[PDB]
Design a binder for this molecule. Structure first.
Ligand SMILES: [Zn+2]
Lengths: 101, 113
């Protein structure tokens, strides 16, 4: 008496990796049930702010079907990024078809 | 573009609400006053208790002003959500003002943005 209802988790992870110009160090460490907890370590090469380096790591939060990326410590230093996660299935199919060229 | 159109470094300020225009045009010392940036800086530093309401002397010659807005929400937001909201707000408002200028004032949209 993470929810994979829209797209796959690896797709979200690779989208996050693509958004970051610098490499992602702990990408493998992220799983279905740690992305809201595990802090992100970049390779500096931060795009969101064009600054050379950041004193504090970034973090991911899941909010109403979106992944929001914000830098810890003082959030005003680095811009907050928003990633849409909910997706029409008929659109993911089209994306997959265009991936094959 | 004249000198007053080039810039206006002298500022005019009131001291309360509801001052009649007769007193303003009579340069009443109890309500209106004229200052500069440095003068108002020491004024507000020395006399925090006063209430200061900056405005124009008159709309005939000093119509040029910086674009400004007042936002009042009866709530509180955490810092990260506040940042997201302010970014969306700034992009929407910048777009809207630029589009209005392009369609009416005939200015360049991208310059305004
Ligand atoms: Zn940054």
């Amino acid at each position: 008496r993470w929810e994979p209802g829209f797209i796959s988790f690896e797709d979200a992870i690779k989208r996050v990796s693509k958004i970051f110009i610098n490499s992602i160090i702990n990408f493998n460490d992220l799983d279905e049930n740690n992305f809201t907890t595990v802090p992100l370590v970049i390779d500096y090469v931060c795009a969101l702010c064009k600054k050379r380096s950041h004193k504090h790591p970034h973090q991911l939060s899941l909010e109403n079907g979106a992944i929001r990326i914000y830098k810890t410590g003082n959030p005003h230093s680095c811009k907050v990024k928003i990633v849409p996660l909910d997706g029409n299935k008929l659109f993911n199919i089209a994306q997959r078809i265009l991936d094959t060229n | 573009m004249d000198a007053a159109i080039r810039g206006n470094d002298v500022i005019f300020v009131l001291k309360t609400i509801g001052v009649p225009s007769a007193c303003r045009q009579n340069e009443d010392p109890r309500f209106v006053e004229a200052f500069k940036c440095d003068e108002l800086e020491r004024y507000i530093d020395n006399n925090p208790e006063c209430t200061l309401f900056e405005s124009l002397r008159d709309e005939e010659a000093y119509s040029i002003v910086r674009i400004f807005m007042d936002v009042d929400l009866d709530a509180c937001l955490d810092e990260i959500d506040y940042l997201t909201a302010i970014q969306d707000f700034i992009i929407e408002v910048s777009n809207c003002v630029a589009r209005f200028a392009f369609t009416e004032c005939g200015a360049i949209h991208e310059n305004v943005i």
